Amino acid sequence: TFTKACSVDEVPPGEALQVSHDAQKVAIFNVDGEFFATQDQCTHGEWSLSEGGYLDGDVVECSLHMGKFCVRTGKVKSPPPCEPLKVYPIRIEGRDVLVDFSRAALHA
């Protein structure tokens, strides 16, 4: 089941947004009109990747110790993080952004 998480204008290109469902915090990223959803917690220290997190193209930088992840694959781009992010399916219908919060997946 895909759940409406936010509306598209809440996440403009180059921005991120934290959403929540059940226990789970999820970061929504808009990269040039394409939407991506990952776990919100940085895998180094669990800081929110949607709190002061710079987005440079499709690479998000954690504000705390400058760890970086590709928001497409969840793959690490710069330490201190070691583990990739969980990634969630995400779909746009009209102005609605829908995320399947039940379907977290993880590389490697």
Residues found near ligand FES in the complex (CB under 6 A): 42, 44-45, 47, 62, 64-65, 67, 80-81
Q: How far is the CB of 57 from ligand FES (least distance, A)?
A: 18
Q: Is 82 annotated as a binding residue?
A: no
| Residue 107 among known ligand-binding residues | no
The answer to whether the annotation marks 65 as part of a ligand binding site is yes
**C-alpha pair distances (Å), 28 with each of 37, 81, 97:** 5, 19, 9
Identify which of residues 21 and 65 has a Cβ nearer to ligand FES in the complex: 65
Q: Indicate the annotated binding residues.
A: 42, 44, 62, 65
